[PDB]
């Protein structure tokens, strides 16, 4: 069915719309931007003599293009056929690549949504989404990008993250506030993220191996993901997807990459709330994997050794978790999850380690707080 | 009887494009060296301007089934509709294909169409389809039916670009009607007999001297003169001439006594002609008209003409023989006979005279494909390098 549909649409090409029609087309990204401008414009969007009152032409154009991109991405052949090397599947994927440029997809992902804001009286002014740019439109582009072009190189992965995905994660973190959490923006953006973006990074987790020179971007990614996870309005499936993505990324990340995330976890875990299960398991996995890095004075040759500041952080984590578990009332889930974490941290920490009297003084509650996170 | 398109038959892909609400007939063409990109060079105005069919000529080597091609890529025939065909360009020896590299103006989607050396690849092969509703898949291919071809590689038709200011051929998903005209058929051709499009040397009455232009003194005005020289001039490229016929279709057929044709010097790319001073002068392609540039071969010197006879569609009789036969060149309009000036490297001049002389017998000698292709390459290289030098001088 995909081959028949793609053959017919490519035979009779005006189905793609004016932008992709092929006669001086401004392009997919330019059509996206122009439709956004039309949606902002009141005269062009409406009849001027909600949906029943006025079908928003800008939203209609954007929805049409998103549906076309989604249909093409679903018409793209599966990866197993390409791996087998079927010439028909290779030809279809090449045809779709010729149809849709990569830069236009990257630009459409780079486009940023309008923002719900607190008003003077205190209520939340919520932009009407049926008349504006919506995360589902970018979800379609992410689906096309994954199925057609693919993500196989770390350079493209990092560039895509930095240009398009990190701003959306930061926007979701900004919406994670209690007042704006119930807004349609928070729910839709969380749905889009946990459905398309986070699973894509989970599948492309092994590409995060050699990111030594891009350390700041990955640290920002970890911080944004952890704040989104601490977010309250998330459903069980969204929470599970975020947990899986964070564990997968931190598993492949280099031990010196995650130090600010370790400091955040050191502060957050000892409260031992229901939210602490994923941080506890992540600490368990990290310490179990990198016990060679910490305890052994030589450490991993490629990954170096500890700077002993993270060693102080690990010891404080161990003691805080031990005390919190000791005073905490028993329940099987948290105790069974906490025991491996304590064992792993105890194993990772060198027994001979000398806790320095002069640690970095005045640990700052600025980048670190429960009240607004900053 | 309707002839069926035959493998190893030479055919020009010929399409019509309308401009000023007027129809222009065009043959797809390409130049072997320097420009693998294809172009359309016009044949409608055969009168005023000679069409260069040497580049429009194409050869249908193999006509395999589509799925036969499928498992072939996985690991004399009668052409049929819906069967992949591979075309070899007659002059260059290369194969028509979609380049997959596109200038992409107006239509970013379409690719370009050009020649490539290698036979292997799905790019070379093109799938036939019946443009007419009467014809169907698997039907016999007509001799002169309109046709549409689809590239195997990208499923794009061989398409004509109307939108561009100059007519462009490109691989696109918009269909385009192409008509096939049989230039010649190799199998039915007879050895040693003159056929259209052949490159030949006009040896004069002494057996040895050949009609030629002066050797290159870097002066085209000096080159334009026409005379007889004997010696190494015969083996040189200056003595070579091409016989191109007025007919666009079946131009490769055997040549007949009294059949109007044009004589072109391959090295200079100029057409033999008659001036008002009765002296032969080579002219430019655009300025060479049919009345000015047209000649016939006649076995007998008698004044009475052979008579009016209609063009047949086929190879025809093996009527003119190389070497053995004696041919007298006569201008079609004036009726003058090509004669030797007989007065003062012989460097004896050639003039058109109505009575002529007794020693006007001329014997034709075939030129090898290597020599003809080399001469064409020399002309192209001279033109390009002269353009380069003029640009550097500017």
């Amino acid at each position: 069915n995909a081959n028949v549909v793609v053959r017919l649409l490519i035979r009779r090409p005006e189905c793609f719309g004016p932008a992709l029609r092929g006669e001086g087309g401004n392009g997919l990204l330019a059509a996206m931007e122009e439709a956004i401008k039309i949606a902002e414009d009141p005269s062009r969007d409406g009849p001027s003599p909600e949906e029943d009152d006025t079908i928003h032409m800008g939203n209609a154009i954007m929805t049409f293009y998103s549906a076309l991109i989604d249909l093409l991405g679903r018409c793209a052949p599966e990866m197993h056929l390409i791996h087998a090397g079927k010439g028909e599947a290779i030809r279809i994927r090449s045809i779709l690549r010729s149809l849709i440029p990569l830069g236009d997809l990257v630009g459409v992902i780079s486009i940023a949504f309008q923002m719900p804001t607190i008003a003077k009286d205190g209520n939340v002014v919520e932009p009407d989404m049926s008349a504006g740019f919506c995360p589902d439109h970018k979800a379609a582009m992410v689906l096309f990008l994954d199925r057609v072009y693919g993500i196989e190189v770390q350079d493209f992965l990092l560039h895509l993250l930095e240009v398009g995905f990190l701003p959306d994660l930061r926007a979701a973190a900004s919406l994670d506030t209690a007042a704006l959490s119930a807004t349609d923006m928070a729910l839709a953006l969380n749905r889009y993220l946990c459905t398309a973006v986070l699973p894509l990074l989970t599948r492309c987790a092994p590409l995060f191996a050699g990111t030594e020179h891009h350390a700041s971007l990955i640290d920002s990614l970890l911080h944004t993901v952890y704040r989104l996870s601490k977010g309250c309005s998330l459903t069980k499936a969204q929470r599970d997807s975020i947990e899986v993505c964070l564990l997968s990324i931190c598993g492949q990340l280099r031990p010196s990459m995650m130090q600010h995330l370790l400091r955040r976890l050191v502060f957050d875990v000892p409260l031992l709330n229901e939210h602490a299960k994923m941080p506890l398991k992540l600490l368990t996995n990290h310490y179990e994997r990198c016990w060679k890095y910490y305890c052994l004075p030589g450490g991993w040759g490629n990954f170096g050794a500890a700077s002993e500041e993270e060693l102080h952080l690990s010891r404080k984590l161990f003691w805080g978790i031990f005390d919190a578990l000791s005073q905490k009332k028993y329940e099987q889930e948290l105790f069974k999850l906490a025991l491996p974490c304590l064992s792993a941290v105890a194993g990772a920490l060198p027994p001979d380690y000398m806790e320095s009297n002069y640690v970095s003084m005045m640990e700052k509650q600025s980048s670190m707080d429960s009240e607004g996170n900053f | 009887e309707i002839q069926f398109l035959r493998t190893d038959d030479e055919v020009v892909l010929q399409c019509t494009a309308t401009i000023h609400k007027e129809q222009q007939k065009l043959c797809l063409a390409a130049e072997g060296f320097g420009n693998r990109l294809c172009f359309l060079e016009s044949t409608s105005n055969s009168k005023n301007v000679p069409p260069d069919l040497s580049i429009c000529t194409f050869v249908l080597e193999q006509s395999l089934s589509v799925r036969a091609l499928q498992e072939m890529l996985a690991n004399h025939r009668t052409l049929l509709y819906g069967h992949a065909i591979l075309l070899r360009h007659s002059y260059s020896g290369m194969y028509l294909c979609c380049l997959s590299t596109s200038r992409s103006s107006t239509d970013k989607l379409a690719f370009d169409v050009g020649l490539q050396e290698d036979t292997t690849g799905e790019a070379c092969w093109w799938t036939i389809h019946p443009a007419s509703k009467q014809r169907s898949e698997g039907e016999k291919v007509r001799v002169g039916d309109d046709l549409i071809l689809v590239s195997v590689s990208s499923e794009r038709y061989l398409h004509l670009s109307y939108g561009n200011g100059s007519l462009h051929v490109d691989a696109a998903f918009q269909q385009t009607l192409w008509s096939v005209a049989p230039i010649s058929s190799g199998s039915e051709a007879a050895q040693g007999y003159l056929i259209g499009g052949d490159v030949l040397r006009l040896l004069h009455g002494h057996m040895d001297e050949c009609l030629t232009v002066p050797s290159g003194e870097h002066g085209e005005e000096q080159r334009r003169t026409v005379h007889y020289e004997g010696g190494a001039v015969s083996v040189h490229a200056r003595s070579l001439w091409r016989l191109e016929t007025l007919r666009v279709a079946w131009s490769g057929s055997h040549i007949r006594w009294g059949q109007p044709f044009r004589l072109r010097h391959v090295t200079t790319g100029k057409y033999l002609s008659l001036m008002e001073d009765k002296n032969l002068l080579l002219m430019d392609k655009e300025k060479a008209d049919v009345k000015s540039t047209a000649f016939t071969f006649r076995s007998s010197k008698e004044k009475l003409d052979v008579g009016v006879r209609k063009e047949v569609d086929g190879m025809g009789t093996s009527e003119i023989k190389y070497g053995d036969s004696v041919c007298y060149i006569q201008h079609v309009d004036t009726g003058l006979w090509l004669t030797y000036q007989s007065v003062d490297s012989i460097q004896r001049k050639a003039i058109m005279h109505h009575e002529g002389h007794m020693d006007d017998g001329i014997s034709l000698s075939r030129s090898q494909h290597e020599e003809s292709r080399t001469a064409r390459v020399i002309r192209s290289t001279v033109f390009l390098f002269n353009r380069f030098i003029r640009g550097l001088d500017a």
Side-chain angles (χ1 to χ4, degrees), chain A residues 75-89:
Chain A
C75 286
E78 297 277 332
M79 296 298 105
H80 79 278
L81 296 174
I82 308 286
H83 301 336
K86 184 175 175 66
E88 180 63 28

Side-chain angles (χ1 to χ4, degrees), chain A residues 230-296:
Chain A
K230 297 189 292 293
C232 63
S233 66
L234 304 180
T235 64
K236 84 189 288 273
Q238 292 187 328
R239 280 215 179 95
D240 299 333
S241 66
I242 295 170
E243 294 176 354
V244 167
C245 177
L246 184 62
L247 268 68
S248 307
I249 292 192
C250 291
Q252 303 306 2
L253 269 183
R254 182 169 65 87
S256 79
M257 295 300 159
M258 72 291 291
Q259 183 181 1
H260 301 269
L261 187 59
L262 270 293
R263 188 179 66 246
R264 194 65 36 66
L265 287 190
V266 163
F267 169 90
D268 277 290
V269 175
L271 319 165
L272 281 178
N273 59 4
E274 185 54 57
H275 269 291
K277 306 294 189 292
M278 176 278 288
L280 195 63
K281 187 166 31 181
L282 182 56
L283 289 155
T284 301
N285 310 136
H286 168 66
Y287 279 114
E288 274 158 343
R289 193 169 67 62
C290 309
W291 91 271
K292 279 312 212 290
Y293 170 80
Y294 288 97
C295 182
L296 276 71

Side-chain angles (χ1 to χ4, degrees), chain A residues 43-278:
Chain A
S43 62
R44 285 226 287 294
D45 187 68
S48 69
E50 286 153 68
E51 294 288 327
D52 56 357
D53 296 330
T54 289
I55 288 171
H56 308 294
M57 292 315 357
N59 193 58
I61 292 153
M62 315 171 21
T63 302
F64 177 89
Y65 280 130
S66 309
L68 178 67
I69 298 303
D70 178 65
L71 164 73
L72 288 191
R74 301 190 194 270
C75 286
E78 297 277 332
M79 296 298 105
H80 79 278
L81 296 174
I82 308 286
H83 301 336
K86 184 175 175 66
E88 180 63 28
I90 297 157
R91 180 198 297 92
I92 292 316
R93 182 177 45 59
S94 311
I95 286 170
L96 287 179
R97 282 183 177 179
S98 178
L99 263 63
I100 297 309
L102 188 48
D104 294 331
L105 294 171
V106 172
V108 178
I109 300 299
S110 281
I111 305 173
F113 324 107
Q114 199 277 330
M115 212 357 199
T117 51
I118 287 301
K120 275 309 175 161
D121 57 355
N123 65 7
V124 182
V125 62
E126 198 276 332
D128 178 44
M129 257 239 248
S130 175
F133 188 72
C134 66
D136 188 292
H137 288 173
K138 285 174 67 175
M141 308 301 224
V142 175
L143 186 147
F144 191 95
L145 176 64
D146 193 0
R147 293 190 47 94
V148 179
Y149 271 100
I151 301 299
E152 295 71 7
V153 298
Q154 189 190 292
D155 163 36
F156 190 35
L157 187 150
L158 296 179
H159 173 256
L160 186 72
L161 188 59
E162 197 176 83
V163 300
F165 284 174
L166 191 83
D168 292 331
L169 295 173
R170 281 198 257 140
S174 64
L175 294 164
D176 284 332
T177 60
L180 284 74
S181 197
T183 61
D184 311 321
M185 243 12 185
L187 312 168
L189 183 60
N190 290 321
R191 220 173 310 115
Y192 152 67
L193 289 174
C194 299
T195 310
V197 164
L198 289 148
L200 174 61
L201 299 173
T202 317
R203 296 186 299 257
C204 291
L207 286 186
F208 288 89
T211 177
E212 288 53 50
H213 50 87
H214 291 90
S216 178
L217 165 73
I218 193 64
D219 293 310
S220 168
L221 178 65
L222 304 170
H223 303 137
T224 55
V225 172
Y226 187 51
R227 186 142 185 287
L228 187 61
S229 181
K230 297 189 292 293
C232 63
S233 66
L234 304 180
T235 64
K236 84 189 288 273
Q238 292 187 328
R239 280 215 179 95
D240 299 333
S241 66
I242 295 170
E243 294 176 354
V244 167
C245 177
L246 184 62
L247 268 68
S248 307
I249 292 192
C250 291
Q252 303 306 2
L253 269 183
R254 182 169 65 87
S256 79
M257 295 300 159
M258 72 291 291
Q259 183 181 1
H260 301 269
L261 187 59
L262 270 293
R263 188 179 66 246
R264 194 65 36 66
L265 287 190
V266 163
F267 169 90
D268 277 290
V269 175
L271 319 165
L272 281 178
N273 59 4
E274 185 54 57
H275 269 291
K277 306 294 189 292
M278 176 278 288

